[PDB]
Amino acid sequence: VQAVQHVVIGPGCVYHGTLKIHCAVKSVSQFLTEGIIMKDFSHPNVLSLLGICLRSEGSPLVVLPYMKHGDLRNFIRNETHNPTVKDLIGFGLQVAKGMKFLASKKFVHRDLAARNCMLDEKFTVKVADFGLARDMYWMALESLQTQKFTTKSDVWSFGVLLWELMTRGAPPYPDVNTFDITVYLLQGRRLLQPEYCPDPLYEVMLKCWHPKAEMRPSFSELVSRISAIFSTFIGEHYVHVNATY
Ligand SMILES: COC(=O)Nc1nc2ccc(Sc3nnc4ccc(-c5ccc(F)cc5)nn34)cc2[nH]1
């Protein structure tokens, strides 16, 4: 009742909100629950909770920092942007860092994908779509079979997210139907290496998709390996969109 005063800012879909600061605003005891804990999830590569509006009474309103450049998927798809291999790998280093943070908190995302990451005005990537701002506006083999999610299944998802980055936002398995993805994978298949994807980064993808969950890299390992691959590029290789996809 009184231990929530550090989160609450008093006296559905999302809207453009004001306060000068530009925010995005998402339309009661359990509300102060995640409000306080989500407030504790502060990291440069994770979407912050600025606060909650309950007065008087509110929707209540979940208020979040506005992200100048929107979601990562639409950003890389935009034909007027000219990303390099370095930029894209950079985005998929920032996501790994955000996830490393979430995993350290033993928090499982369950729906990691490029559409659920945001980019701000400094081009910092924020892992989003969790906590109160979790909604429907990539799954590991075992998850499709058990409906259980772990950080190890987040890692599988991250591998698919890296594929998205390097294809500039192409739909994964476009000629495949959702009902039979498990059958598809169990035939011995994975997503193809993107034309502009470095061999080592594809090896990283394949590791994220290991059939044994415990053998997939931790996000700490992924941050380490991808920081290395990233450091080798200087931004001379431009990534173009694939005609078929
Ligand atoms: C030029 O893009 C913007 O509108 N800027 C923007 N800043 C935001 C700041 C917070 C939010 S709410 C939120 N919290 N987790 C998620 C995960 C995904 C999306 C999402 C992205 C794309 C899209 F089409 C529809 C939904 N939103 N979202 C939305 C925002 N949109």
Mutating to test ligand 1, I would choose from 81, 137, 164 the residue with most ligand atoms within 8 A of its C-beta, which is: 137
- The reply to whether ligand 1 has any atom less than 6 angstroms from the CB of 129 is yes
Please state, in angstroms and rounded to a whole number, the distance separating the CA atoms of residues 88 and 7. Answer: 34
Beginning with the edge strand found earlier in the chain, give each strand of the sheet holding 51-53 in spatial order: 14-18, 22-26, 61-65, 51-53
Which pair of structure tokens corresponds to residue 99? Answer: 């996830």
What is the Cβ-side half-sphere exposure of residue 6, based on CA atoms within 13 angstroms?
A: 8
Q: Are 38 and 131 in contact (CB under 8 A)?
A: yes
Please tell me the distance from the alpha carbon of residue 5 to that of residue 157, in angstroms, as a whole number.
36
- What six digits make up the tokens of 87? 């930029």
Is 26 annotated to bind ligand? yes
Conformational region of residue 127, where left means phi above 0, alpha means psi within -120 to 50, and beta covers everything else: beta
Q: Where are the alpha helices (DSSP H) in 54-126?
A: 72-77, 85-104
For residue 131, say whether it is annotated as part of any ligand binding site: no
Ligand 1 close to Cβ of residue 133 (< 6 A): yes
Ligand 1 neighbourhood includes 201 CB (under 6 angstroms)? no
Active-site residue list: 111
Q: Alpha-carbon distance 47 to 24, whole Å?
A: 11
Note whether 74 and 61 are within 8 A (CB): no
DSSP character string of 187-234: TT--PPPPTT--HHHHHHHHHHT-SSGGGSPPHHHHHHHHHHHHHT--
Of the candidates 50, 95, 101, the residue with the CA atom closest to the CA atom of residue 75: 95
Domains detected in the chain: 1-66 (3.30.200.20), 67-245 (1.10.510.10)
Residue owning tokens 């990291």: 43
The resolution of the experimental structure, rounded to one decimal in Å, is 1.7
Whole-angstrom Cα distance, residue 218 to residue 158?
Answer: 11
**In angstroms, rounded to a whole number, what is the distance separating the alpha carbons of residues 118 and 184?**
30
d(CA 47, CA 91): 15
DSSP string, 8-27: B-----EEEEE---EEEEE-
Cβ atoms 217, 228 nearer than 8 A: no
Phi first, then psi: give them for residue 183, nearest 5 degrees: -60, -40
C-alpha closest to that of 114 among 42, 70, 164: 164
- Describe the chain by its helix, strand, coil percentages, rounded to 5: 40, 10, 45
SS3 36: helix
Element (H or E) spanning 65, and its range?
Answer: strand 61-65
8 Å CB contact between 64 and 133: yes
Phi/psi of residue 203, each to 5°? -60, -40
Q: How far is CA 88 from CA 127, 199, 210, in A?
A: 15, 15, 23
Ligand 1 centroid distance, CA of 163 (Å): 21
Token reading at 175: 């000629």
Residue 53 DSSP SS3: strand
Q: Side chain identity at 230, as an amino acid letter?
A: F
Alpha-carbon span 129 to 43, nearest angstrom: 15
Looking at the DSSP bridge assignments, the partners of residue 117 are 127
Residue entry with tokens 């506006």: 137
71 lines ligand 1 (CB under 6 A): yes
Q: Which residues pair with 119 in a beta bridge?
A: 125
Q: Which residues contact 237 (CB under 8 A, 6 or more apart)?
A: 84, 85, 86, 196
Q: CA–CA distance from 222 to each of 17, 143, 152, 227 (Å)?
A: 36, 21, 12, 8
- CB 49 within 8 Å of CB 97: no
Number of neighbouring beta carbons within 10 Å of residue 98: 25
